Structures are given as C-alpha cells and as structure tokens.
Design a protein around this nucleic acid. Structure first.
Ligand code: ZN
Length: 259
DNA sequence: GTAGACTTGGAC
DNA sequence: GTCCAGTCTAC
C-alpha cells in the first residue's frame, strides 16, 4: 500500500470507527508492537479511550484517540477491517481492538512486517517514525525547488531519490515507475544529471499521477503504463516494456519514451 | 549502492 | 522446488 491506497483506507475506515470506545486490545503477534516495547502496556493504555479521528502522513495511518495517537504502518500486506466480535477471525489476524458496542477493528498481515507506535498526540510528530518524513506531495510544501535541492547533491539514481521518504513522503514502487514514465525519464540515471526542465516536469507528473490515483481509489490499475507490464507493448509508442533492477527493486520502463 | 533480514503464500 | 512482492541495518 502506497499513498493512494492508504488514503483510500483512511476515508473508508473513519466513518466505521469514529466515536467508538475501546474496551479491550488483544495481541497475537507481539513483534508488531514497537512502542511502548511491552505489548501489555500498549494494550492497557488504550483501554477506555474513544476514537476521535483518522489522519494520514506519508504511508502511515494516524488513529487519533483521547490522549494518544496510534501510528500504524501497513508495510507490504497489512490490512484493516471492521466486524462483529461474535464472529470468528480471519487467518493471520494479529491485533484486535474491541469496542464497547460489540464491534471490533481487526488488523491482518500475512508476512508480519507492519508496525504500531503509540505516543501522546503532541509527541507523535516529533518522535520516530514520523519525525524525519518529507513533505506531503499534494501540498505547497512539495515544489520543484525541494526536489532540485535534494536532487543536485547526490550520486544515486533518480528512482532511489523518489523512494526516500525523507525527500517526499508517500511514493512507492508502483507510482515512482509510473511517474518517471510520464515525465519521460529513465529510472536508473543519476539524480544529479536531471535538468531544471526535467525536474519541473517530473514534479508535475508526480503530483498529477498521485492525484489521479487517489480519485480512482488506488490500484487505477487500468491506467498503468509500465508497472507489471514487462513484455507488453507501450500504450504510447508500441515498444515492448522492460523490467530490470534498480535501487534493489523491480523496475519497469519504456526504453523509447524514457531517456 | 546492491545486498541481508524479517516472514508467508502463490506462480511455474 | 525456486523466484517475486516497505523499511532497518550493514559488507
Ligand atoms: Zn513508449
């Protein structure tokens, strides 16, 4: 889940939990709990608090309670669902929040990579993992200048720069590949080699790509140009789409539209 | 920077 | 059976 999917989860989940009061917290896989370290303390402190809201920062979900904020990162496969506490749980359910009205918020995660941090609302933004995140892509804080400032000061590929949550937050493998294609830039090239003209266009395609994705509720998979299409013809020039590895990850691109 | 880990299931 | 799918930490 990248920014578009997490934003979709946020909008759907909020009306289902706002106003509900936590009666119990059950944890079946302790390692997901990062702070406080003791999973027993994590559970005890939330009991009695009511859900006041749900926000998003980068790829993180921020559950706003009475005094605390629960910061959740879904990583690769984490997922949330609301259901009746009288029914049996689905496989791979690792954390459950039971509400006083008989309902519950279930957290599933097959690979167990997700993390959960709890801090007082006022400390959240100044403590890890939210402290060092870059600006939100769909806000005035993200501008060509910001990208250029970070770009012209590193030898790594442009794709590595965009995957760095401290440069800009919310972009993942799918939308980095799609944005680079639309801007017409090869992923594996030095970020320092990009021109003012290139950086500006990229900034523009990034904003437009992530914006459209949210409106379509995320993967919008019918609107992908390169991700997952290795071997198939380019939708604009017809050249077969290629796949290699860059920044330690699968990377898709068109050798003709991208330079 | 391209790995090395954490950890489970589906494709071929 | 072997290859593929967002951070942290490390040769
Ligand atoms: Zn093309």
């Amino acid at each position: 889940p990248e920014l578009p999917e997490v934003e979709t989860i946020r909008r759907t989940l909020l009306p289902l939990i706002v106003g509900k009061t936590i009666e119990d917290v059950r944890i079946f896989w302790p390692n997901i709990i990062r702070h406080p370290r003791d999973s027993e303390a994590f559970a005890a402190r939330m009991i009695g608090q009511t859900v006041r809201g749900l926000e998003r920062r980068g790829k993180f979900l921020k559950f706003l309670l009475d005094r605390d904020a629960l910061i959740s990162h879904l990583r690769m496969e984490g997922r949330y669902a609301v259901a009746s506490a009288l029914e049996p749980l689905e496989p791979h359910t690792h954390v459950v929040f039971c509400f006083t009205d008989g309902s519950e918020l279930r957290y599933r995660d097959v690979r167990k990579f997700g993390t959960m941090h709890v801090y007082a609302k006022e400390e959240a933004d100044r403590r890890p993992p939210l402290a060092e995140l870059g600006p939100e892509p769909l806000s005035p804080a993200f501008s060509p200048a910001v990208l250029a400032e970070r770009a012209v000061k590193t030898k790594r590929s442009v794709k590595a720069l965009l995957l760095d949550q401290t440069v800009v937050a919310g972009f993942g493998n799918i939308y980095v590949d799609e944005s680079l294609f639309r801007a017409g830039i090869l992923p594996g090239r030095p970020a320092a080699s990009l021109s003012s003209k290139e950086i500006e266009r990229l900034h523009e395609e990034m904003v437009a790509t992530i914006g459209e994705a949210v409106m379509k509720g995320g993967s919008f998979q019918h609107h992908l140009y390169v991700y997952g299409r290795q071997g198939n013809p380019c939708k604009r020039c017809g050249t077969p789409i290629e796949k290699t590895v860059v920044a330690g990850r699968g990377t898709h691109y068109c050798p003709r539209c991208q330079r």
